[PDB]
Amino acid sequence: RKVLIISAGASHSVALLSGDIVCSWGRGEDGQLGHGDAEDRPSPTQLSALDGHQIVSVTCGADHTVAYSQSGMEVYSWGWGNFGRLGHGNSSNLFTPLPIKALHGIRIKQIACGDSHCLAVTMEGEVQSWGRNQNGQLGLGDTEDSLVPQKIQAFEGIRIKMVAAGAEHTAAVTEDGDLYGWGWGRYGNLGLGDRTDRLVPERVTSTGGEKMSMVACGWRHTISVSYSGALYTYGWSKYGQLGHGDLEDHLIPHKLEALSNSFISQISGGARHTMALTSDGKLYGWGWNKFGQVGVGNNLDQCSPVQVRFPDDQKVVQVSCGWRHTLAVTERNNVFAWGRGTNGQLGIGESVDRNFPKIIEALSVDG
Fold it and tell me: What ranges cover the RCC1 repeats?
């Protein structure tokens, strides 16, 4: 019963557990939960179709989910199908997982989903993308949607470490630490200096001197971390989601100085909030907080990082933001949720908003 991976989208939440079990909950009416029907589930619900497929990761886009198995060399997807986001060669919704034929046999390193597009990194550092491409977020050269995966040629030669997908933009880091951005850019969230879209990856030259190790994306903002553990945000800060103690927008990465003492080892981007996990198990939240999603016990927005408190200060080992809610796994193998819960995405049975971490009993040691 070790909770291994957590992911969250617009109104649903999925989890991989030890023993080869996927759980999903939240909004089900577009098929995002993968149980063969369109019913919402306010408690974690085992996804029987994936029992024993030896899944190793799960990732949510806004209204779909993607899973993959390394031993089976098989990627699966389900949920809302419009614009090709499920990658099956059509735009049909799917209420049960189905393998993406195009990726069978591919050795997958990582998958990232946005509102309507996805990206796979292979173990050899190439990247394929599919889904909505209206603002160039597939990174392939134009604004034509792709219902199946196509390789990003611009990265020929370059080995990609990690990708992240926001609403309509994309970001990536190479093995060498270069930082890239493409897609919708109106809000500066690509890090390039301007407000113009890019149809292929363009390299972020202004990285504060530093090689970058990870990336993460919200609706209109981007987060990046450097090899030294320093955190950088860029894009829209109307709700404080850039975390700099103001509401200024930034068109290039901007170091978050209040955290410059800490080593960030994991970042996540919600719609208009941000989560940063330090190497020592402290979870800092900020941004939009109308539904409680920052986890600091009130419903006031936060333009500076605030620590999310857990019982007996047990340390957080993993965090994932949905649009309007947050999920975290602790070292005491507990799972906590907070933010908007009106669709069951918190997984606590009763569908109500919570503004500080509340344990998910179906998945946690404690209660």
Answer: 18-70, 72-123, 125-175, 176-227, 229-279, 280-331, 333-367
